[PDB]
Amino acid sequence: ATVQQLEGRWRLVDSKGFDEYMKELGVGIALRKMGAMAKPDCIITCDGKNLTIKTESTLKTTQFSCTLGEKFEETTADGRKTQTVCNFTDGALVQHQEWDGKESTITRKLKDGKLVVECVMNNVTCTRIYEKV
Numbered sequence: 001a002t003v004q005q006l007e008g009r010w011r012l013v014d015s016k017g018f019d020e021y022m023k024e025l026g027v028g029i030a031l032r033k034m035g036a037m038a039k040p041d042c043i044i045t046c047d048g049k050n051l052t053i054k055t056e057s058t059l060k061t062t063q064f065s066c067t068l069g070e071k072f073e074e075t076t077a078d079g080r081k082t083q084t085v086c087n088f089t090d091g092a093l094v095q096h097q098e099w100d101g102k103e104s105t106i107t108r109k110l111k112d113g114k115l116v117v118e119c120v121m122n123n124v125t126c127t128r129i130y131e132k133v
């Protein structure tokens, strides 16, 4: 298991719990409708400890870059300005976001050749699955 195994362009094939996660975040109706109906690609590139994650669809595209282990200001899809850290740990990329005394974790793992993305805030969870393209 290495962070490099997560590289490439990945296409969303299954979502569960995403709308609920967005309601927990407090996302408004315009963006929730967009997120319910987008089928984005995820594009992950990594060079050593440098990581970029771009999420791309007609409806909505976002991108961030970071150094693994380093705290940075991430502007999210829904416009939060979080203190984020990403680490590759026990075979998963773990992204922890902190803002206004709130927290959310997003994990990304390779399973059976598919990218599995899991999100949680206050026990409200989502699982999104991507196949490689």
Ligand SMILES: CC(C)c1nc2ccc(Cl)cc2c(-c2ccccc2)c1C(=O)O
Residues within 6 Å of the ligand: 022, 025, 027, 031, 032, 034, 035, 038, 040, 055, 056, 057, 060, 061, 062, 077, 078, 106, 117, 119
């Ligand atoms: C971190 C992840 C679960 C995520 N969280 C979000 C949290 C809130 C919103 Cl409004 C969007 C997202 C979007 C996302 C970005 C573009 C198209 C569809 C979904 C994504 C995404 O797929 O990158």
